[PDB]
Structure 1
């Protein structure tokens, strides 16, 4: 919409902090239960270091960094995946939706 060019957005569909918005605009962004995480998701089901979101030549990827419960993209377990708009990402009991920006 009014998002800067080359950026993207994640929005919490289901979870305690539902409606929260996060901005992907730097080469690596960390997500876990560690209090110094970029995307801080406090629950027993999330691991301290759980996944990273990486932007490489204007292309957005999710990567599992060794969690117990794993990461799911559209109710299917994955180790790495390139995301298209409107994809559901599950980290623990949190469910997030990915929205791209202008090119």
Structure 2
């Protein structure tokens, strides 16, 4: 992992094994075709969550999803993520891993 970045790895879901680099201030996650992290399932809202970098601090922010964004099984409006945290969006379960400072 490049310095200052982080990674999300899909552990459960139709694209299990897939993984996405977080290396910009805002990364969108949803079913909208232009989502940075495109999670294509009915359980996922068009705009579901955003992952922010502020600053050396990675945060997930639920942006008004229908069925919630879960961090370690608990729904959150916003939550600063720590390595090994499981993020659930619809049926997709991902794990967060921080890169170098």
Same fold (TM over 0.5): yes
CA RMSD, 1 decimal: 0.6
Give the greater-gyration-radius structure (CA): 1
- 1:21 is displaced (CA, Å) by 1.0
TM-score, length of structure 1 as denominator length? 0.96
Which residue in 2 is equivalent to 1:81?
79
Which residue in 2 is equivalent to 1:58?
56
CA distance in 1, matches of 2:21, 2:55: 18
- 1:27 is displaced (CA, Å) by 0.4
Gaps of at least 5 residues in structure 2 are: none
Count the aligned residue pairs: 101
After the TM superposition, which parts of structure 1 deviate over 4 Å for at least 4 consecutive aligned residues?
A: none
Gaps of at least 5 residues in structure 1 are: none
